[PDB]
Amino acid sequence: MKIQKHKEIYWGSTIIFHSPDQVYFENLIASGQTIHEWSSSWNYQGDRQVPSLPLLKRGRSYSLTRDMTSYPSESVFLKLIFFDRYNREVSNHVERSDKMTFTYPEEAYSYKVQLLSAGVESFEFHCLRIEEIL
Amino acid sequence: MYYFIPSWSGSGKRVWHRDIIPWYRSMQRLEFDDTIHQIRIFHSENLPVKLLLQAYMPHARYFLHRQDIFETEYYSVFDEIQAVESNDMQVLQIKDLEWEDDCEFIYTPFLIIVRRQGQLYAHVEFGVEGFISFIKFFKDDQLEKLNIFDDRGFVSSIVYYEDGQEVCQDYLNPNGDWRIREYLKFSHVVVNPVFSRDFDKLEYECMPDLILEKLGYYISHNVEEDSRFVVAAQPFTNQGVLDLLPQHSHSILSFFHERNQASNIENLKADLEYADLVLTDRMDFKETLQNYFPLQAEKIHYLSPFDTRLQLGKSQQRHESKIFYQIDLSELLNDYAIFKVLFYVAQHPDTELVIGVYNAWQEGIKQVENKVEELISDYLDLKDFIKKSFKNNQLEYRFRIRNITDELSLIQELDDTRLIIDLSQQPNLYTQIAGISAGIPQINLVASDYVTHLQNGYILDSISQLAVAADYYLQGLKNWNQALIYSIEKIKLNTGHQVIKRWEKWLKEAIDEKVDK
């Protein structure tokens, strides 16, 4: 195998896959609802929905970055949820912008990031980026 | 600072090689550890600590994480051997491997079957957390290759198959170039010439030699002067590692029952003489050592481990008293004991029952299910097992049967559990640890270091008395609470700064004994 290294997080139903690194979308999704979700964990053992997001360190601080453009401009939001070991929520941050900095809480066992929605007509999506900051 | 050298092994003859197991064949043998207990103490009470890993663990990130020590700094023998430079993890999707164009995929509920032009090409299996764990490769209905993936997102290793048998395994670098090759027939390990820069010796006879090499080189050239080494007592002899320790350093030797229950006291003599400090998680093993080796009695101390992944129990937020009843299915079924519990739950309509079965395969779970159905049908009424939620609004029952595969499984189940019953002759050790950790009382048939009679739980004479035990904690609030108290002030004096304090004090007390001669 060649494995195809990259440190970016890709996408993985008008959802059109014009490339691994670019995805088209047309609205179907209520304002406030979820357009997509990434998780650092399996929802249940059998699940064919495999984790996408890397393991994080507690107390440390990171930068979550969208690389996408939404046709009705500032329409797609970016929610970030931290869950504990019992699957109960811990905390949630939403960001209108395309960059966000959070500090990974010390109760957090896993995390998910969702793309939420304002009135979104269409978007082109490239990726997410997480790197450690200070 | 403090260095920890864990004993994290495989179960084969290659002990330095951790087992690779698909998510479904997964079963519970104890993964929590005296080491993990200790390292966790250093991370709260923020002290500096580092981990020295001598074993091959392609999936060690999820392991550390799952065990709540992901933030610990580690040096890894096989990370040097394979020239893994960055700890950056890229969670691999199947989509980005990638395969030939003709490959079609078929999704088993267990794995993924890749066929190309109708012929079986590959099985893609997953690990308990859901990352690609390994892929089997096929050439004409014959297994030829096995790729083992690193949880950081590359091919860590390849096993080659001759006539359907392991012949050879080479360990790649994250770029794909083999660095060492290991021959698995009785028999050595060869270094790839291109990378001779990083290995003194060009070939090694047994794998532990190359291991012993890289480890000692770290301890000599990279350890800050006067440090402290906590060594998990490995199954055989500790000379391998003890005789690599600095001239000026303190050594702590740590004994965990699950690991060292079976060891003859005679071969301990060498390692027990060297060690500055000795720790056991069993009182009577401390005593066994203090009698056979009376000259070193003073340096052996008892320390009980506790899993702090367990939040304290939220069973006060429930009207229903939930009962966790443990069944070891390697012992077959015991109709008398299953019935005494089923009968107690029938009588007290304010209770729910989870029957936690471990060491069981899919079909053995069904056996437990039928035996419960049967016993209920023949002697009781199934209608008395319908839950309030369902019959106060009118199917769903007050009892169900859960397969306990993970420790995580059990941790979840214990969150709202009010009472633990284990009627085996050897009670699942992790459940005893998890029980006292979450502050839930326990009923066992044999005494232990985690359950104190009429304080922490009840120690039954025979299962005939099961109701007297059950009542003691299920009836009223007083006893159940005097037990949360007892359990809490026992979690306290075994996971504070207090414990490391006691270690430093015990190290000073071991010097003041040397001056006596």
Chain-chain contact of B130 with A51 (C-beta, under 8 angstroms):
yes
B273: preceding bond cis by omega (within 30 degrees)? no
Please state the φ and ψ torsions of residue B489, each to the nearest 5 degrees.
-80, 20
Nearest to B343 by CA among B314, B379, B368: B379
List, in sequence order, every beta strand (DSSP E) within chain A: 16-19, 22-26, 36-39, 61-70, 78-83, 89-95, 99-103, 110-115, 122-132
SS3 state at B251 = strand
Chain-chain contact of B91 with A54 (C-beta, under 8 angstroms):
yes
Chain-chain contact of B61 with A12 (C-beta, under 8 angstroms):
no
In terms of C-beta density within 10 A (0-12 exposed, 13-18 middle, 19 or more buried), how is residue B148 classed? buried
Q: Looking at beta carbons, which residues of chain B come within 8 Å of A48? A: 107
Tokens of B50: 């580092």
Q: Looking at beta carbons, which residues of chain A come within 8 Å of B130? A: 41-42, 47, 50-51
Whether A63 and B151 have beta carbons less than 8 Å apart is answered as no
CA distances from B375 to A114, B141, B338, B369, B385 (A): 48, 47, 9, 10, 13
Which candidate in B100, B126, B132, B411 is best for mutational testing of the A interface (most A CBs within 10 A)? B126
Tokens of A121: 């007509």
Q: Looking at beta carbons, which residues of chain B come within 8 Å of A5? A: 90, 153-154
Resolution (A): 3.1
CA distance A58 to chain B (A): 7
Locate the chain B residue with the closest alpha carbon to A57: B71
Experimental method: X-ray
Tell me the C-alpha distance between A26 and A120, whole Å.
Answer: 8
Q: Report strand pairing: B189-191 vs B178-183.
A: antiparallel
In terms of C-beta density within 10 A (0-12 exposed, 13-18 middle, 19 or more buried), how is residue B504 classed? exposed
Locate the chain B residue with the closest alpha carbon to A21: B96
Chain-chain contact of A3 with B154 (C-beta, under 8 angstroms):
yes
**Residue among A4, A58, A60 whose CB faces B96 most closely:** A4
Tell me the C-alpha distance between B131 and A50, whole Å.
Answer: 7
Nearest to B438 by CA among B403, B488, B495: B488
Tracing tokens 């691999």 back to the chain, one arrives at: B92
DSSP B451: -
Which candidate in A7, A8, A22, A85 is best for mutational testing of the B interface (most B CBs within 10 A)? A85
Which segments of B181-222 does DSSP mark as H helices, in order?
207-221
Chain-chain contact of A86 with B71 (C-beta, under 8 angstroms):
no
- Stated as kind and residue range, the H or E segment containing B433 is helix B429-438
Any idea where the domains of chain A sit in the sequence?
2-134
Tell me the C-alpha distance between B306 and B450, whole Å.
Answer: 10
The DSSP result for B370-428, as a single string, is HHHHHHHHHHS-GGGGB-HHHHTT---BSEEEEE--SHHHHHHHHTT--EEEE-SSS--
Nearest to B437 by CA among B333, B307, B348: B307
Tokens of B82: 């394979």
**Residue among B107, B155, B309 whose CB faces A3 most closely:** B155
Tell me the C-alpha distance between B490 and B450, whole Å.
Answer: 9
Whether B143 and B134 have beta carbons less than 8 Å apart is answered as no
Chain-chain contact of B97 with A2 (C-beta, under 8 angstroms):
yes
Whether A65 and A98 have beta carbons less than 8 Å apart is answered as yes
Tokens of B18: 């951790």
Q: Looking at beta carbons, which residues of chain B come within 8 Å of A45? A: 23-24, 128
- For residue B205, give every residue at least 6 positions away whose Cβ sits within 8 Å of its Cβ, in sequence order, or none: B187, B188, B189
Whether B450 and B442 have beta carbons less than 8 Å apart is answered as yes
Counting every residue written for chain A, the total comes to 134
CA distance B415 to chain A (A): 8
Tell me the C-alpha distance between A53 and A37, whole Å.
Answer: 10
Chain-chain contact of A50 with B130 (C-beta, under 8 angstroms):
yes
Q: Looking at beta carbons, which residues of chain B come within 8 Å of A20? A: 95-96
Q: Looking at beta carbons, which residues of chain B come within 8 Å of A62? A: none
Tell me the C-alpha distance between B147 and B171, whole Å.
Answer: 10
Count of pairs with CB atoms under 8 A, one residue in A, one in B: 79
Locate the chain B residue with the closest alpha carbon to A11: B93
Angle at Cα A65 formed by Cα A61 and Cα A69, nearest 5°?
A: 165
A interface residues, B as partner, C-beta within 8 Å: 1-7, 10, 12, 20, 40-42, 45-48, 50-55, 57-60, 85-87
**Residue among B131, B147, B155 whose CB faces A51 most closely:** B131
C-alpha B403 chain-centroid distance: 17
**Residue among B90, B107, B135 whose CB faces A5 most closely:** B90
Phi-psi region of A68 (alpha: psi -120 to 50; beta: other; left: phi over 0): beta
**Residue among A10, A41, A86 whose CB faces B129 most closely:** A41
Chain-chain contact of A51 with B129 (C-beta, under 8 angstroms):
yes
Tell me the C-alpha distance between B381 and B387, whole Å.
Answer: 13
- Stated as kind and residue range, the H or E segment containing B466 is helix B466-474
Which segments of B293-352 does DSSP mark as H helices, in order?
335-347
Tell me the C-alpha distance between B493 and B512, whole Å.
Answer: 25
DSSP B294: T
Nearest to B32 by CA among B258, B283, B260, B262: B258
Measured distance between the N- and C-terminal CA atoms of chain B, rounded to whole angstroms: 30
CA distance A119 to chain B (A): 30
Chain-chain contact of A53 with B91 (C-beta, under 8 angstroms):
yes
CA distance B382 to chain A (A): 30
Tell me the C-alpha distance between B9 and B15, whole Å.
Answer: 5
**Residue among A7, A41, A58 whose CB faces B71 most closely:** A58
Chain-chain contact of A42 with B130 (C-beta, under 8 angstroms):
yes
Whether B395 and B386 have beta carbons less than 8 Å apart is answered as yes
